[PDB]
Amino acid sequence: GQLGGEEWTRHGSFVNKPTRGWLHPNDKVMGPGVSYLVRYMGCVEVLQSMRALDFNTRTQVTREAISLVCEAVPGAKGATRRRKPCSRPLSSILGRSNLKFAGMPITLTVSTSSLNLMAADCKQIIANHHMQSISFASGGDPDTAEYVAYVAKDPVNQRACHILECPEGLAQDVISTIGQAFELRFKQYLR
């Protein structure tokens, strides 16, 4: 028989007004949510977490994704094409690099308890609208500032690193925005 399955309807906006006297980003992150232009470029399935990973290892596994992705899959503005064909991802520390989802326009949407990406491809909304279910985010202004990444609980895998192309500044922007947005209720007891 067939008794229940999945109802595919993702709709749940957070509405709460203590005030609206915020600044441009804050207004949205607390209300609708700020939006940045990003490009889905590859995805790496990581079966591990920061809790479980080494200080360099977690940076390596994240950069790995961004690395072999940008140096192999389409979208990257700078590649020399170097992929280890039949080998391990980095040290088989995580799952594996899956260069399948590359070349899809999306939108980094930051929200109080949500961090989802809207497919500008007019497909739908991806990622998860749940702050408590994220993990990594590579960005800021490093070597990799030209290619951004975020690792969260994946709709397919347990966790996945999703690399964003064409940041235009989204790197440091989303990092600062998401961080400081959540920081509005950030306790000093942890992190």
Partner: peptide, 27 residues
């Protein structure tokens, strides 16, 4: 053992800043 990384080559080496906040792991 003390190298620096677990392994490195054209595909894979650490080089970037990846983190978020206190959601999954207080690091």
């Amino acid at each position: 053992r003390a190298k620096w990384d677990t392994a490195n080559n054209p595909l894979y080496k650490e080089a970037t800043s990846t983190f978020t906040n206190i959601t999954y792991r207080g690091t």
